[PDB]
Amino acid sequence: TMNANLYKIWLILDPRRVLVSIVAFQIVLGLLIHMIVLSTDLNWLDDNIPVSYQALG
Amino acid sequence: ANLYKIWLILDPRRVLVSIVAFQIVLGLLIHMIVLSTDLNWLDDNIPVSYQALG
Amino acid sequence: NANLYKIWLILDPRRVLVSIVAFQIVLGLLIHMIVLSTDLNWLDDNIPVSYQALG
Amino acid sequence: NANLYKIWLILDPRRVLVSIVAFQIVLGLLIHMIVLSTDLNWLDDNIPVSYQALG
Amino acid sequence: TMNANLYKIWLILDPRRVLVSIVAFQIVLGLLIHMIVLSTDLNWLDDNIPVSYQALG
Amino acid sequence: TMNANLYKIWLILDPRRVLVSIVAFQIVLGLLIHMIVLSTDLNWLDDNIPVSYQALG
Amino acid sequence: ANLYKIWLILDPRRVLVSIVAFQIVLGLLIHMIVLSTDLNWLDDNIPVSYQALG
Amino acid sequence: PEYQNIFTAVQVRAPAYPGVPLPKGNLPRIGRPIFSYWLGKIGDAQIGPIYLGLTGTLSIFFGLVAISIIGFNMLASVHWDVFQFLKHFFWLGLEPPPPQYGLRIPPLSEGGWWLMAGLFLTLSILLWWVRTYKRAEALGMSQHLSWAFAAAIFFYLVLGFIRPVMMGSWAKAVPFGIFPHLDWTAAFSIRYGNLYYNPFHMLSIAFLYGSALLFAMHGATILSVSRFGGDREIDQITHRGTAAERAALFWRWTMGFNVTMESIHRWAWWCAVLTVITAGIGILLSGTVVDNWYLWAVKHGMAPAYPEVVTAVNPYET
Amino acid sequence: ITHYIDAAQITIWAFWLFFFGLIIYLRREDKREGYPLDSDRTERSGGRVKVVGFPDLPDPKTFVLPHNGGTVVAPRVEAPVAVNATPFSPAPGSPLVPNGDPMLSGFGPAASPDRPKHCDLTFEGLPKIVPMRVAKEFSIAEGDPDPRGMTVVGLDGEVAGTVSDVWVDRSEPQIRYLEVEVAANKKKVLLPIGFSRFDKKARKVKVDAIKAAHFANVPTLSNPDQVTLYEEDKVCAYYAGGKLYATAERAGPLL
Amino acid sequence: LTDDEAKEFHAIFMQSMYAWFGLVVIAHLLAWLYRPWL
Amino acid sequence: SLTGLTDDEAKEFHAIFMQSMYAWFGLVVIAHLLAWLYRPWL
Amino acid sequence: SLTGLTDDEAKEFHAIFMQSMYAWFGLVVIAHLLAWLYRPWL
Amino acid sequence: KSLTGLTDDEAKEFHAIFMQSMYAWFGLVVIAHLLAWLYRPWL
Amino acid sequence: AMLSFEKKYRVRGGTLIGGDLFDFWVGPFYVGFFGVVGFCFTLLGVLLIVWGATIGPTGPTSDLQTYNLWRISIAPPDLSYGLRMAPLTEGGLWQIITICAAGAFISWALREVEICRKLGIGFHVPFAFSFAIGAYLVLVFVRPLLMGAWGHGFPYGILSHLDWVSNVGYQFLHFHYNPAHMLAISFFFTNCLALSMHGSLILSVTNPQKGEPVKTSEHENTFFRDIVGYSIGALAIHRLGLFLALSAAFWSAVCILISGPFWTRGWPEWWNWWLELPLW
Numbered sequence A, E, F: 001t002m003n004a005n006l007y008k009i010w011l012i013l014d015p016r017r018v019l020v021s022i023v024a025f026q027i028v029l030g031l032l033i034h035m036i037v038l039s040t041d042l043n044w045l046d047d048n049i050p051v052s053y054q055a056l057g
Numbered sequence B, G: 001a002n003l004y005k006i007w008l009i010l011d012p013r014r015v016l017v018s019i020v021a022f023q024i025v026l027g028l029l030i031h032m033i034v035l036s037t038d039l040n041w042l043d044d045n046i047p048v049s050y051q052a053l054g
Numbered sequence C, D: 001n002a003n004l005y006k007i008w009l010i011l012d013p014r015r016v017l018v019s020i021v022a023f024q025i026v027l028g029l030l031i032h033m034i035v036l037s038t039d040l041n042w043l044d045d046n047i048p049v050s051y052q053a054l055g
Numbered sequence H: 001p002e003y004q005n006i007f008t009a010v011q012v013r014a015p016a017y018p019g020v021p022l023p024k025g026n027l028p029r030i031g032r033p034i035f036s037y038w039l040g041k042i043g044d045a046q047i048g049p050i051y052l053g054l055t056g057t058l059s060i061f062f063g064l065v066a067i068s069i070i071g072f073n074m075l076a077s078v079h080w081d082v083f084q085f086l087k088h089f090f091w092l093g094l095e096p097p098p099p100q101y102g103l104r105i106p107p108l109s110e111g112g113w114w115l116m117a118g119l120f121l122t123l124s125i126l127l128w129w130v131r132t133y134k135r136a137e138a139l140g141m142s143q144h145l146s147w148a149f150a151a152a153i154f155f156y157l158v159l160g161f162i163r164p165v166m167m168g169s170w171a172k173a174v175p176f177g178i179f180p181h182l183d184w185t186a187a188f189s190i191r192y193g194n195l196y197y198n199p200f201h202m203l204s205i206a207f208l209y210g211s212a213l214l215f216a217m218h219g220a221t222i223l224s225v226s227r228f229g230g231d232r233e234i235d236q237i238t239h240r241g242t243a244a245e246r247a248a249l250f251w252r253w254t255m256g257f258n259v260t261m262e263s264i265h266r267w268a269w270w271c272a273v274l275t276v277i278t279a280g281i282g283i284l285l286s287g288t289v290v291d292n293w294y295l296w297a298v299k300h301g302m303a304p305a306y307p308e309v310v311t312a313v314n315p316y317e318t
Numbered sequence I: 001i002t003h004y005i006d007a008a009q010i011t012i013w014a015f016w017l018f019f020f021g022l023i024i025y026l027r028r029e030d031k032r033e034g035y036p037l038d039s040d041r042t043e044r045s046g047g048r049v050k051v052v053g054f055p056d057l058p059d060p061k062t063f064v065l066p067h068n069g070g071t072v073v074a075p076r077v078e079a080p081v082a083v084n085a086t087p088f089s090p091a092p093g094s095p096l097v098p099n100g101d102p103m104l105s106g107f108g109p110a111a112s113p114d115r116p117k118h119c120d121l122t123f124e125g126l127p128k129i130v131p132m133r134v135a136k137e138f139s140i141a142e143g144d145p146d147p148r149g150m151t152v153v154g155l156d157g158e159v160a161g162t163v164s165d166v167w168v169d170r171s172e173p174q175i176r177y178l179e180v181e182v183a184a185n186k187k188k189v190l191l192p193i194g195f196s197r198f199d200k201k202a203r204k205v206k207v208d209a210i211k212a213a214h215f216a217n218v219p220t221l222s223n224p225d226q227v228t229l230y231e232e233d234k235v236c237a238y239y240a241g242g243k244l245y246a247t248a249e250r251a252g253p254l255l
Numbered sequence J: 001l002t003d004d005e006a007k008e009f010h011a012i013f014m015q016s017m018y019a020w021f022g023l024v025v026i027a028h029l030l031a032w033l034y035r036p037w038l
Numbered sequence K, L: 001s002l003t004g005l006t007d008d009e010a011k012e013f014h015a016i017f018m019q020s021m022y023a024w025f026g027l028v029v030i031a032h033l034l035a036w037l038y039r040p041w042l
Numbered sequence M: 001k002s003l004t005g006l007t008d009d010e011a012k013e014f015h016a017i018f019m020q021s022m023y024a025w026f027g028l029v030v031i032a033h034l035l036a037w038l039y040r041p042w043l
Numbered sequence N: 001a002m003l004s005f006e007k008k009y010r011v012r013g014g015t016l017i018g019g020d021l022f023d024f025w026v027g028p029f030y031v032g033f034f035g036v037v038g039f040c041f042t043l044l045g046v047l048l049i050v051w052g053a054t055i056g057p058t059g060p061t062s063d064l065q066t067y068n069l070w071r072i073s074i075a076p077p078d079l080s081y082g083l084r085m086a087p088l089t090e091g092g093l094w095q096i097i098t099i100c101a102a103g104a105f106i107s108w109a110l111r112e113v114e115i116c117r118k119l120g121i122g123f124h125v126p127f128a129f130s131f132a133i134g135a136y137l138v139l140v141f142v143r144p145l146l147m148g149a150w151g152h153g154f155p156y157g158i159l160s161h162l163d164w165v166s167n168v169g170y171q172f173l174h175f176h177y178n179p180a181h182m183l184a185i186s187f188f189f190t191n192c193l194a195l196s197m198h199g200s201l202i203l204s205v206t207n208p209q210k211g212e213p214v215k216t217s218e219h220e221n222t223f224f225r226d227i228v229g230y231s232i233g234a235l236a237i238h239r240l241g242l243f244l245a246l247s248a249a250f251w252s253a254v255c256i257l258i259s260g261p262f263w264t265r266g267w268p269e270w271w272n273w274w275l276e277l278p279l280w
């Protein structure tokens, strides 16, 4: 249910600064989520899957 | 009924940017608070613990 | 009082509103944190169950 | 006194109102915390029940 | 045993600043003395009178 | 499934300035990702593979 | 094919100095990384321990 | 490159300024002013003249007596041996009376000299306080310096006088000596269970750091706009110039807000003054109210907890 | 007996009350210049809405100037002053671009307020900042070179002129400006000490701020024997504009 | 603000505040039924 | 005369101020009665 | 007005604001339902 | 006389490229999580 | 919003990196290239600090995890990891946050350089801020590097880092005798005196006694000549204050840099070179 005049948001919010804000936030957010996930049981690098490489050698 | 007149007092642009900033901060805060607790869905070994496989 | 409306000739309506919103949001966060710091904590009470025990 | 009203000829009503409001909120927050640091504490008194035990 | 021309003090000291200062001084002194009294045997908040409410639960 | 007028982004962001920002971001991202991976079981420097060279001496 | 046009928009001289400064740091960085691992070639007592010769 | 306005490259000279005339009742100033070329590289080349009335004369006399009583006892403590006095100078001190004497005047041979040095330095400082007040009065200036000085005197008084009296013993005051007064500082923290956990110690640190923060900011800001006459803060305050405008915008653009040319000196004034206010309160509460700051911090829920990786059996329990 | 509340805890809370009151005091003092703020909310509100933040502005204080110089008030209503620039983009938060030749635009680092058209005074009431020709009691400190007769060079090493006199502070003795007789037009212009490096062995004053040819447009003094506050700021701002405007490379960026 | 403008703001401000207080009351009745604290 | 308000405006502001403050004090009294019934502290 | 918006402009922004806010709250309710179904916390 | 300087047509034009570009980004996000959910389901 | 005199200074250009791409303000803040970069480092670092608080030292379910403001602590790795990267949950989180902080700090200073370029002012403030950055980097980079492990860095916790300071200090028995530490403290103390002296004098001459006009430069010089027989001058007092504050920071860095890398015994025993001189 998007409003027909939602495009008018760019009459209030500046494109370049909005674009910069989105890119910056998402990079920070993507880096954060990876480091959150890595610091849990969901960790995909040290799970010795498919094999452990410090054990193998 | 005349609640629309709020935009004659408070700047619509300033309200919008404030809501977006507040909601993102509150949203991040609540995830972290819940994650500090028993409700944590990342470290609950549900559906299984993947480190116990290796 | 009947003339209580005249307070908005004394205090800026715009500023009062913004002050109420800011105060209330901070007060609401403060009260939750206080309650969560007490026996009343509803997040770590293992109710209805402990989900970490389920794993 | 009958002319005590003339105090609003010497003190700015706008400043006095805001100062009272600010003082009352701070006093209210301060007093609640003082009482929370005494035997009168009503949040962690396990009355009616301790919610961390019942769970 | 008061003077009749004592009212002339308000020709010397600013009455607005005197009243404001009195209000400030009285509010602070009141906070101080309560805490002084609180930190003595006269302490009325944590004295378990009429009862101890933590011992009640 | 791109937008055929995606090139118009260079009418909003200065193209020569974006190049410098991308290159230095990528160098710092590469540094971060190596460090992170080096902190894990996938570590290729301290894995004694093919051999441990400290045990040779 | 038009990659040389990069030097019409970025000043060649400071690109050079950035590269030189970057390379020297990276070179120091990589050695200190290598030295802090099993590949360390200074304290590996290869071909011999010169201290043990005492 | 550019001129940084750190050193005066070209000094000029004019006949020495005798000072703003003072009202009747002030004594004439004394001294023939001289010029130092090398002081003139970093600041004002004029040295002197000086004002010296009864207050400052009495102050200096008390202060010279106090300083000499200290030095005499230092020299006596290496048996007049001047070479050993120089060898051990940083270690020597004049020691407070033993605890057995309480607050009573102790014997000349065992603490009387400390109490006399403490009395007369204290009177010397109090008279110096009056001097700072009088010199401003004679110039028609407000009393900001003497108010800030009083805050420092407060802290000084708490360390050596107020707390020892409250604790009933001169033995709890500070010895006069370089390294000896450092011993006192460390021993005080040990005795009272780690001063890091004293919340007024924490505040005092915040304000001491803030003073260096604020003077670095302000010192650097003014030199960067001194090309616009920004060091002339009187006329920048009454008649805002581009110096004061550019300074505020540098900070507004950096951290989102800014002050004025006048009000930065209020921030600076309060930051410095609060350093010694909180320090006095912190010491005033130590021993008198709180005996172990760590356990006080434990009690109010502040002390960090760590995984146990070392631990020791208490032989007093066994 | 035992109590949770103790005097250390009471006192530290009392400090926070004092401290936050102090912070609001200080923030009020901070708003005696530059406020209320120029915003696009005040434009669209037709001036109904003044942007001042929190806390609000203090009641005005008065500065009484010596020698019957008048009264200064703070805060004060200041007339808007036109900006000699046009926006780089119409979007809020965009910089502006100086009109015309940037050196002469009075915009950016070339900008300055309109200070009073009178001379700062000594305690005794004389013009404070004056050339050594007028304050004949001044001399150069022994050991340092006399700048008079030194050659003034611009950022590109070209000869801009000769030092024709030295302007000193009579209240607190120091050089504040060098007087430069500009070769190109034979006008005498002030040069702030803040923009001057001495090369003593060469007897040259180096000015990195502007080119030799830029000296022709240093703002001129209405009266050659004194300098008004107004003229002091216009002079200093013109040199400062060169820091950003005097060459193309100075616009940036590095990369 | 004019006199008529102040009455209009006051009427809308009071209904809005009482409405906000209504949500506050509902939240506490829900909280009291789930976890009474006195 | 020193704050700007007229003598009538001060009588009118005082009247509303006193009724407002008495109303606030009334709320304060109600809360302390409720507090005394739930948890008498003297 | 204090915002510069006309009476008709405030009605228009209000309609889009309220429409967007209700939509956002609808997403919030859906998320708390899924979270309640997966891991009830009360 | 808009606040951003954009005309009405430009806002529409920017909005259409912005919406299309954001959906493509979110689409990649969905694919990443589908792959992640297939590889390592976390609920 | 802008200061009422600000608009005439908001000039285009003067960037070091970025040019027109990021050359804009966000409210009062100038952004620019180092504004964008610094914001990312900062938000990441802050959010990773909060995540470390969320999981605590041994997981979010343990009794050691806490959001108590004084007790939150994110700690560096064990010394056994040397100069390598530890696992995120074993100090690696601290290691990433440190790099964010350094990047956040250095980006802040370079942004300041761009602001100075816009305003045509001297570069003293970013230059002075570099001393604070250097001290942070001595603490987390140079000194750990010279001793061979990032774990010699201090932990990021409001009270826990005071425990670090305490235990590092007492490794040298009586840290008060560190000569660079004594010198640095003298600068810290002298700076505070000088700051109170400067603040007082400016406020006292611009706010004189009632009925008095604003006082003059002649009053300022006379006033301290009357008290101490010397006046340094209104320019030089700002020179002095910057020198004292920067000297305090520099000798701080020196005093911790020599504690471990260049001295391992008690600090009092260092003074035995003095005691053992063949004069006495």
Ligand SMILES: CCCCCCCCCCCCCCCCCC(=O)OC[C@H](COP(=O)([O-])OCC(O)COP(=O)([O-])OC[C@@H](COC(=O)CCCCCCCCCCCCCCCCC)OC(=O)CCCCCCCCCCCCCCCCC)OC(=O)CCCCCCCCCCCCCCCCC
Pocket (backbone or CB within 6 Å): D022, D023, D026, E028, H126, H129, H142, H143, H146, H147, H150, H151, H153, H154, H157, H277, H280, I014, I015, I017, I018, I020, I021, I022, I023, I025, N203, N207, N208, N209, N210
């Ligand atoms: C045991 C002690 C041993 C001490 C030994 C000392 C030896 C010397 C002994 C002799 C002492 C003589 C004292 C002076 C004599 C008379 C001087 C004089 O000329 O008077 C006329 C003098 C001048 O008149 P004027 O017309 O104002 O002239 C001013 C000029 O025009 C120019 O004025 P201006 O425009 O610059 O303005 C002046 C300035 C005024 O500043 C000062 O002059 C004094 C500076 C303070 C110095 C003391 C430090 C205070 C420490 C407090 C922290 C303690 C912690 C606990 C907190 C408790 C408080 C709650 O304005 C401000 O800075 C405003 C300050 C606002 C205060 C903080 C704001 C918040 C207050 C609370 C807010 C509400 C709370 C709840 C809020 C809720 C919401 C958050 O009268 C004054 O108004 C100024 C008063 C200052 C003089 C007395 C106070 C300072 C001197 C004593 C300091 C002692 C320090 C020791 C502290 C101990 C620890 C607690």
Ligand code: BCL
Pocket (backbone or CB within 6 Å): A022, A023, A024, A026, A027, A029, A030, A031, A034, A037, A042, A044, A045, F018, F021, F022, F025, F033, M025, M028, M029, M030, M032, M033, M036, M040
């Ligand atoms: C078990 C867990 C899974 C896993 C689960 C997921 C999931 C689930 C997701 C990711 C996502 C990402 N993962 Mg992962 N991830 C794993 C392991 C890894 C590892 C690793 C070392 O192990 C790495 C390096 C990555 C890397 C990445 C990124 C490619 C991506 C986040 C990009 C981002 O935030 O952009 C920040 C965003 C922006 C900048 C905005 C969008 C950019 C658009 C395309 C256009 C911008 C161009 C603009 C003009 C210029 C930009 C340059 C600027 C100058 C800076 N994954 C493992 C195997 N990963 C996300 C993803 O792929 O997103 C689609 C995602 O949803």
Ligand code: BCL
Pocket (backbone or CB within 6 Å): A033, B019, B020, B023, B024, B025, B026, B027, B028, B031, B041, L024, L027, L028, L029, L031, L032, L035, L038, L039, M043
């Ligand atoms: C068991 C507990 C559940 C859980 C319970 C909840 C609940 C309950 C809610 C969320 C919500 C959110 N969760 Mg969660 N969440 C879980 C796991 C995760 C994980 C993870 C790594 O495991 C991540 C990254 C997230 C991330 C998020 C966000 C997508 C969203 C908050 C956005 C916000 O702050 O808006 C602030 C920003 C704005 C208001 C800006 C304006 C709107 C813009 C234009 C759109 C932004 C994108 C939007 C959020 C689309 C996502 C909707 C999806 C249906 C989730 N969840 C677990 C599995 N999560 C909230 C949500 O979806 O709200 C609707 C919410 O209420």
Ligand code: BCL
Pocket (backbone or CB within 6 Å): B030, C020, C021, C024, C025, C027, C028, C029, C032, C042, J020, J023, J024, J025, J026, J027, J028, J031, J034, J035
């Ligand atoms: C047993 C204890 C209960 C509990 C007891 C209470 C009580 C009691 C109250 C709240 C209130 C609120 N709680 Mg709680 N709360 C619980 C758990 C949570 C959790 C969580 C992670 O578990 C969260 C995030 C919240 C969040 C919230 C907010 C939605 C709300 C306060 C917002 C505010 O301050 O507005 C300040 C903002 C403004 C004044 C802005 C202007 C108003 C605007 C127009 C309305 C905004 C949206 C509105 C708040 C939506 C919800 C009302 C519904 C009744 C839910 N609760 C637990 C389960 N909660 C308060 C509330 O709902 O008030 C009505 C309240 O009084």
Ligand code: BCL
Pocket (backbone or CB within 6 Å): C031, D021, D024, D025, D027, D028, D029, D032, D035, D042, J038, K024, K027, K028, K029, K030, K031, K032, K035, K039
């Ligand atoms: C045993 C101890 C009691 C207790 C003893 C008391 C006592 C006794 C009093 C309060 C008062 C208050 N308590 Mg309590 N309080 C308890 C538990 C709580 C808890 C909690 C999480 O447990 C909370 C959040 C509160 C909250 C509050 C506020 C509603 C109120 C202070 C407002 C104020 O400062 O005004 C400052 C703001 C202003 C002056 C602004 C102007 C007033 C405006 C116009 C009115 C705003 C709405 C008003 C606050 C509504 C409340 C009145 C009702 C009669 C309750 N109480 C426990 C159960 N509380 C006070 C009170 O009700 O005051 C009447 C009071 O005297």
Ligand SMILES: CC[C@H]1c2cc3[nH]c4c(c3C)C(=O)[C@H](C(=O)OC)c4c3nc(cc4[nH]c(cc(n2)[C@@H]1C)c(C(C)=O)c4C)[C@@H](C)[C@@H]3CCC(=O)OC/C=C(\C)CCC[C@H](C)CCC[C@H](C)CCCC(C)C
Pocket (backbone or CB within 6 Å): H209, H212, H213, H216, H217, H220, H254, H255, N041, N042, N043, N044, N045, N046, N049, N097, N100, N101, N104, N105, N108, N125, N126, N128, N129, N130, N131, N132, N155, N156, N157, N158, N161, N245, N246, N248, N249
């Ligand atoms: C060199 C002399 C002194 C000095 C000067 C100095 N500092 C300065 C400046 C100057 C000249 C600035 O221009 C600059 C400024 O803009 O001030 C307003 C700054 C500044 N000095 C600051 C702080 C400060 N300076 C300090 C010290 C000093 N600064 C000196 C002693 C200290 C001390 C002693 O501890 C601190 C607390 C800031 C107010 C500001 C720099 C602001 C900044 O860089 O912002 C970007 C970063 C953030 C907003 C937060 C980043 C968060 C990180 C990514 C994560 C956190 C990691 C951190 C290591 C955790 C620490 C945790 C525990 C220790 C609690």
Ligand SMILES: COC(C)(C)C/C=C/C(C)=C/C=C/C(C)=C/C=C/C(C)=C/C=C\C=C(C)\C=C\C=C(C)\C=C\C=C(C)\C=C\CC(C)(C)OC
Pocket (backbone or CB within 6 Å): H067, H068, H069, H070, H071, H072, H075, H105, H115, H118, H119, H122, H156, H157, H159, H160, H161, H173, H174, H175, H176, H177, H178, H181
């Ligand atoms: C031989 O030497 C000559 C004569 C040539 C001169 C040389 C002198 C030298 C070299 C002196 C060296 C001095 C040094 C190195 C001093 C170092 C001092 C330090 C570091 C002191 C630090 C702190 C001291 C403090 C804080 C002391 C405070 C003491 C107080 C406040 C004591 C007050 C006592 C009072 C008010 C006593 C009152 C007595 C009553 C009234 C109670 O009597 C009953």
Ligand SMILES: [Ca+2]
Pocket (backbone or CB within 6 Å): A044, A045, A046, A047, A048, A049, A050
């Ligand atoms: Ca794997």
Ligand SMILES: [Ca+2]
Pocket (backbone or CB within 6 Å): B041, B042, B043, B044, B045, B046, B047, M042, M043
């Ligand atoms: Ca899971």
Ligand SMILES: [Ca+2]
Pocket (backbone or CB within 6 Å): C042, C043, C044, C045, C046, C047, C048, L041, L042
């Ligand atoms: Ca629960």
Ligand SMILES: [Ca+2]
Pocket (backbone or CB within 6 Å): D042, D043, D044, D045, D046, D047, D048, J037, J038
């Ligand atoms: Ca209860």
Ligand SMILES: [Ca+2]
Pocket (backbone or CB within 6 Å): E044, E045, E046, E047, E048, E049, E050, K041, K042
């Ligand atoms: Ca009782």
Ligand SMILES: [Ca+2]
Pocket (backbone or CB within 6 Å): F043, F044, F045, F046, F047, F048, F049, F050
């Ligand atoms: Ca390998």
Ligand SMILES: [Ca+2]
Pocket (backbone or CB within 6 Å): G041, G042, G043, G044, G045, G046, G047
């Ligand atoms: Ca080898």
Ligand SMILES: [Ca+2]
Pocket (backbone or CB within 6 Å): H095, H175, H180, H183, H184
């Ligand atoms: Ca001793």
Ligand SMILES: [Fe+3]
Pocket (backbone or CB within 6 Å): H218, H222, H233, H265, N198, N202, N238
């Ligand atoms: Fe200054």
